[PDB]
Amino acid sequence: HHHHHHMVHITLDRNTANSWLIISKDRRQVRMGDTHQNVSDNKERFSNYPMVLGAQRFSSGKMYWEVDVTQKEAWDLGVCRDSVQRKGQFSLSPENGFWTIWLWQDSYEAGTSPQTTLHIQVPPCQIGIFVDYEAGVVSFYNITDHGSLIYTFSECVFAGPLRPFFNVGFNYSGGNAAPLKLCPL
Numbered sequence: 001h002h003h004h005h006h007m008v009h010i011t012l013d014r015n016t017a018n019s020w021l022i023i024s025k026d027r028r029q030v031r032m033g034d035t036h037q038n039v040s041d042n043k044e045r046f047s048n049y050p051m052v053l054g055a056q057r058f059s060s061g062k063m064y065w066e067v068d069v070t071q072k073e074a075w076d077l078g079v080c081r082d083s084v085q086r087k088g089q090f091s092l093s094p095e096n097g098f099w100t101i102w103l104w105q106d107s108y109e110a111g112t113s114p115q116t117t118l119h120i121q122v123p124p125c126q127i128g129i130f131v132d133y134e135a136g137v138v139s140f141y142n143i144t145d146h147g148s149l150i151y152t153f154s155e156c157v158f159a160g161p162l163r164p165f166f167n168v169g170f171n172y173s174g175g176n177a178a179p180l181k182l183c184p185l
């Protein structure tokens, strides 16, 4: 892919974060805390899962960013509608306004309904996410493996502004404490 020149500077929006997340001062890193992080509740916060949105909203054009997933056992990454449900249980699917991939229990899967098996030969330490709003495209690239394609959602019905989407995952095992990091341009 030659998508790097659509690079955008993504920062995390503290106000959307699950109350157990810790977002770094520079708003470029997020990790699961050991407890509630002493913030007030609000209608923006994801209640049931360790999720947070980027601050940026996209309604046109081509956008690209990269995320470091080094040493994590579980995570979800991609984009979602600004209007996604925040409270209670829900599945990550395009019908619910999410275009995502994830790692769970040693397998990679795309957030279709039902979910799709990914075929990755080189476990990625960094993921590239490309959105073409007009084309209706969300693509994922394996930066560790020379930028190889992971998955393309096409014919996407965004149906509103999009936000970068993150899930640091649970840490029940004690092996998933590591942060998600937005990598420099």
Ligand SMILES: C[C@H](CS(N)(=O)=O)c1ccccc1
Binding pocket: 018, 020, 032, 047, 048, 049, 050, 169, 170, 171, 172
């Ligand atoms: C209780 C856990 C923390 S952990 N480390 O994943 O066990 C949890 C926190 C926030 C949202 C959902 C779940």
